Design a protein around this ligand. Structure first.
Ligand SMILES: Cc1cc2nc3c(=O)[nH]c(=O)nc-3n(C[C@H](O)[C@H](O)[C@H](O)COP(=O)(O)O)c2cc1C
Ligand SMILES: Cc1cc2nc3c(=O)[nH]c(=O)nc-3n(C[C@H](O)[C@H](O)[C@H](O)COP(=O)(O)O)c2cc1C
Ligand SMILES: Cc1cc2nc3c(=O)[nH]c(=O)nc-3n(C[C@H](O)[C@H](O)[C@H](O)COP(=O)(O)O)c2cc1C
Ligand SMILES: Cc1cc2nc3c(=O)[nH]c(=O)nc-3n(C[C@H](O)[C@H](O)[C@H](O)COP(=O)(O)O)c2cc1C
Ligand SMILES: Cc1cc2nc3c(=O)[nH]c(=O)nc-3n(C[C@H](O)[C@H](O)[C@H](O)COP(=O)(O)O)c2cc1C
Ligand SMILES: Cc1cc2nc3c(=O)[nH]c(=O)nc-3n(C[C@H](O)[C@H](O)[C@H](O)COP(=O)(O)O)c2cc1C
Ligand SMILES: Cc1cc2nc3c(=O)[nH]c(=O)nc-3n(C[C@H](O)[C@H](O)[C@H](O)COP(=O)(O)O)c2cc1C
Ligand SMILES: Cc1cc2nc3c(=O)[nH]c(=O)nc-3n(C[C@H](O)[C@H](O)[C@H](O)COP(=O)(O)O)c2cc1C
Lengths: 201, 202, 203, 202, 203, 202, 202, 202
């Protein structure tokens, strides 16, 4: 039925709207989503976009499914230590994962392999199985230690995508900036998108 | 007269509006500016914000002065390879410099000391004189080599400041995101500002 | 405001609680405003080494310390473990000076690697990225290689690693003289006038 | 329509024949090409194989179209700083690029992310977007610094393919050596080829 | 011989002279034989911090310390700055255990880089090459990056870097309790039974 | 009572002229100096400028005091093992130090933390206390090991300022070269100077 | 008598022609050669150029002597583990050695000092005695690990000369490409050559 | 009847009188010079020493020829992309090259192998052919990135010779400082000179 499974982690960086719009576009492209959200991520979603994701995985899954009028099974949320989840094992996990937005703290944890929660274990799995991990980092300025951590991940095939949208297409609202970034994630995932033209400059 | 001199370099990355908004605020704050603009810079300023900066330094100074209604000598623009500029010698150059927006290619030339034009020499000088260089890099995703370049400069005390505006202050307009970044540049320069509040997270 | 400056002070679970308590006292006497963070291992060490039970709840702690030091109104605010709605948590708002004292090798390690897992680690990461001044008063001996790798990294990046190794070359009558050696060094580095450690050097 | 788009950049290293043959094979394989040529590249093409690429991009597109009897829009040449080309942006650029032949100076510029012209930007974009870049470097001997540069690009997923043809197959004429290299580039690009058989050693 | 083992003990010009004096006392009580090296900056610190004037001449120093500690015959021998005809100077002859205490960052640096410019540095270089145990009780704060680079190098190569950062989690009534914390740690690392620092850990 | 205290060490590199003139300017700028001089530096001073610094510290202080017509307490010299000097401890030492001229050997001692004499300890101190250390290194050519040493210091915030005078100003005389280096030192110290003009290139 | 002694090692990389031509030129330049051939080298010589080097060292010396019409003692072949050869000891070995052609596996063994056979020992001896070793490597594309290995040898004064002939001179036949490489090796060895002219680019 | 060929590059660092005195001595020692001058190097010679080198290469050869009363073919100036020059190919280039004065931007370009112009290609070729490159760097203070660039090249056998003259030989005039540096260059190149004597320290 679905076109593929993608793991999506939302962490406590600023940039909630990116994550909300990415999920909208993935659902519309008819992907199945396994969604992980950190406790700080929930705080940011509430403050920035007024979105309150219930803390219980079941209620969260139903909440998101209604928000996006998604199909049966299309969205599943897994809790912070739910090791039964498919994402926890290289024997079962999807091969694509996006962290959006991705805090420098979560980026750091994945860089060093702390694997202390489901989001960090999932990322560690995608890296070991040689899949695709994309981290949409939101911070500025960067410190040298942020850069060392990004460098290490990028050398190992992780895609560091800072939330730094461009303005060279006609930018007429905040949405168009949001769609710049989301369209780049989607191009990287190998998913047809029409939210960001291919005109170039 | 003025609270100080700042060197501003505009290069060909997207995010012209940041640079225009930065000039606007430094003028109102009564700083004197030495502005440098690469060719690709002007092309970006043109297509993104409809601002055709003349490529002659003298006409460029008058245009910007007029555009910002600046005082006499408050803005001086210098040419691609105009070595008499005060920015080209450690004996004379200002100690604060911002490259906004900063292409990955200019970041790279600065990283490695290419010093091939006035912008690159000007940055090399601030670095050797132990001044403050701030580079507003606008590119995504980063490649590994981007990240090696950035890490090398950052270790050497250059502030890598990617154009990654935050959204926690409540954004209703693109101008709030522009002001997010410009306000961070101003904080770093030690310039009082009220375009981005000090509330933090509420 | 109404104060000379703002300082962020984090207490973590290394031995050396008496250095932290003396440092707060001197900073208050100097009329600085303090944002205090304290980890739970931190409170355990305070409790066992100097008998000071800081309430775990941030309002109650602010009051407790305020009364302890007879501090002015809003001079001391404690913030809790994940209280992100705290000015220390954002570069838009935070103090440019922070001291971790005593700093456990675990907190130093989490700062070194950027873990930013609680308010203490985030506040440090912010100070680092904003190019402020972070001082870490590490208390541990011996060092391992990995401790040294972590301290080295931080020191290359402009973080001041100040082990709690007091000197004895001044008048040492009491333990208080050694506490004051280290607190005197922190104050000098913070740019704060102090008379607890004379400037005579070696005689 | 076409089987895919490829970016080709010709630079000022010896080995113009490799490039001309590579174009011939991609045209016959029904690929669409975006061709970039450096000024040194043009001088090399001229002196080595008598091929004079018009200075004008439109004139060059037609000249090559005509030379290879290529279909409509199958060959588009772009100029030195034509930032409006598809190749300059990650939102638009092809995911495969070859630099044939590749001078050590252009390999250097790409290694360090200098991105000063369309070739180096095109490269940097391919690298950041995680596509495939192949560099047919021609120089001998190598210096340590050449090797450092190749090393870092290689670690970053760029294919350093020196123009070092082998002789273990049927070597009669120079064309067999040219075809050795071109066939290796075609195998890497994933394109069906029979100018170099798969017998291996015999 | 007639002793439990041989230990090389070097005193250098860092603050912390009272750690060295207490360490000799415990080693003597434990019936170890000591080869003592003392630098001239070392004697200056001993003199100013604890009032102990070790004669610069090796015979006179051996007698002075022997009497100070009421040591047995040949239990303490001091050796002078370039006294190469000393068993510490050759791998064919030297003790396999050495402590520098207090260890200045200058002596740590000369050992790190292999300078071997006097008997102290040579004796350390020997212990290192013979795969023995070298403990360095560094006293300095803050650390610089270059200090940390030097300590890191040494620690990777199996040298124990033991900063003089005493803990407070045990019963601390006096300064002597903090001196005994560090001396207790040196003894534990040397494999020497000691009761000056209890083994109760944290309560 | 002076504008501040600076530590200045004179070591056995050629360039005694630069040291003598820095001292002149710092005295006229009303700074208090603590001077250290190596026995090799004393030999260089005697042979190059015929200045004979006496060996005893008290006689040294008086000699330099006399020579510069300095005020009371303005110049104090300290001997090579004079650990009572305020420069020996982070609890008491000035936050600015210059080694002029600086031999490759003393730069090496400082690079590696040898801290063998007062000059080396004073530098070690300034570094660990995060002050400002400036090393006017005179040597040519550099070896690789000299460069490794300077790179290590520079990465750690020490200013490696080779005695490499420029000629773009009005160079009528040797003093013009001495003043180029001295002026650059004083700018780094944050001390107003007018011996080297602040227009750059002309 | 002879102008000097050179060690030549042939290994199992493609490019046997380069080696045969190199020998021809050194013989005509009156050098004395100590030749080593690996078993893979022999297989390559056979399949590429029909040259069957006798398995026996004495038979190989005569076979080559005869092939090049060389003088008495001008060519001595030595076997795989003939440690009694001059080439195996630093007390005796020639100070110039070429490995032509050089497989990436023998370049690897030399990079890491494996010294398992006469070729690798000969190499290691040349390197330790600070003579000149040249490695004509033939492989494409390069892997990262190939590049790491070449890098470390290059940093250590070994000449990595890939078999990447250029085409800027008069290219008519394959012999002109062979002569390009051989002439570069002869220039490095310091030996007068006219198979590759010095006109440079025209 | 020239003793040898030297490539001499003049770049945009201060110290033009070094380069002019170096050509004088090399012409008196009967060496043949191939001189390259960048556009920033012209500007420096014009302003510092009042020498205006014509922009076209033939007029510039004639100009310098007359200036030093050089012999027929003793001096040839080559333009910034005159790739037909002997210096641009390893097959033909001189084995000794001096960059004097050397900017930090030209030192960087050579460090990372940019090879963007004839000066940078010439250097890249001297390095790959294992000749001798000497870089007379004039800048102070150095930044960490300057030091990283120098270190890399020195590790690779390039001689980093900063323009840091000594004073231990009795210094009459500025000329004695110029002659200190030029004598060191000449000593490095292996050319007898009597402008800086050999008595060392007295
Ligand atoms: C409103 C808000 C916005 C934040 N924005 C960022 C940010 O943009 N970047 C960042 O690195 N941390 C940010 N933080 C801090 C992280 O939330 C903090 O480091 C937390 O420990 C992250 O936890 P997580 O990585 O488990 O999500 C923010 C916090 C809040 C409350
Ligand atoms: C509309 C437009 C937008 C561009 N945006 C970027 C950008 O966001 N980041 C970047 O690194 N380069 C960007 N480029 C490419 C640079 O302009 C190009 O690499 C050029 O060589 C920069 O030179 P400069 O650094 O001298 O300005 C852009 C070009 C155009 C035409
Ligand atoms: C009484 C006591 C003393 C401690 N002393 C130290 C110490 O001196 N150094 C250290 O690194 N950790 C010490 N610890 C361990 C830390 O408390 C432990 O590593 C903890 O996880 C640190 O957490 P924190 O960094 O969040 O405060 C001590 C613990 C206790 C209970
Ligand atoms: C006829 C000719 C042949 C050349 N061959 C080579 C070569 O094989 N390798 C190389 O690295 N450079 C070679 N060059 C030099 C490059 O052309 C030079 O470094 C130039 O600056 C490269 O510019 P580009 O990288 O923009 O093409 C050659 C030059 C000419 C004129
Ligand atoms: C009273 C006094 C206390 C000192 N304290 C220290 C210290 O605690 N740490 C340090 O590295 N050096 C200290 N020094 C400096 C060393 O004595 C100085 O670096 C000396 O050269 C060390 O020589 P040594 O390593 O040969 O003993 C002190 C000096 C004096 C006079
Ligand atoms: C006349 C003279 C000039 C010297 N010039 C230099 C110099 O320019 N650079 C240098 O590194 N060493 C120079 N030296 C050598 C240093 O003096 C020597 O290495 C000494 O050991 C350094 O001692 P110091 O670092 O304690 O002062 C010179 C020596 C003499 C006698
Ligand atoms: C016909 C033929 C051609 C070969 N060409 C190459 C080559 O060009 N490059 C290479 O690295 N190995 C090549 N090999 C593989 C090497 O022969 C192989 O790695 C062998 O183990 C090398 O042994 P040697 O290094 O002792 O000569 C070739 C093998 C054969 C049979
Ligand atoms: C009068 C004058 C003096 C200069 N001196 C120096 C210098 O001493 N060192 C330096 O690195 N750059 C110096 N520059 C800057 C270089 O000329 C500049 O970075 C230029 O881009 C170098 O280009 P080139 O390397 O192609 O010659 C100077 C410029 C002028 C106008």
């Amino acid at each position: 039925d679905f076109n593929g499974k993608i793991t999506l982690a939302i962490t406590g960086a600023s940039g909630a709207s990116y994550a909300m719009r990415l999920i909208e576009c993935l659902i519309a492209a008819n992907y199945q989503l396994y969604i992980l959200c950190s406790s700080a991520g929930r705080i940011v979603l509430d403050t920035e976009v007024g979105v309150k994701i219930p803390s219980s995985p079941d209620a969260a899954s139903k909440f998101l499914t209604e928000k996006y009028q998604a199909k049966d099974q299309q969205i599943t949320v897994f809790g912070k230590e739910q090791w039964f989840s498919p994402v926890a094992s290289g024997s079962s996990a999807p091969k694509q994962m996006v962290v959006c937005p991705c805090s420098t703290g979560t980026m750091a944890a994945i860089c060093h392999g702390m694997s202390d929660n489901l989001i960090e274990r999932a990322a560690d799995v995608v890296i070991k199985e040689r899949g695709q991990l994309i981290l949409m980092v939101r911070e500025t300025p960067f410190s040298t230690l942020h850069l060392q951590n990004m460098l290490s991940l990028s050398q190992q095939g992780v895609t560091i995508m800072p939330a730094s949208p461009g303005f060279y297409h006609k930018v007429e609202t905040i949405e168009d900036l949001i769609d710049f970034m989301v369209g780049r994630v989607l191009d990287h995932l190998g998913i047809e998108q029409d939210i960001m033209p291919r005109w170039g400059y």
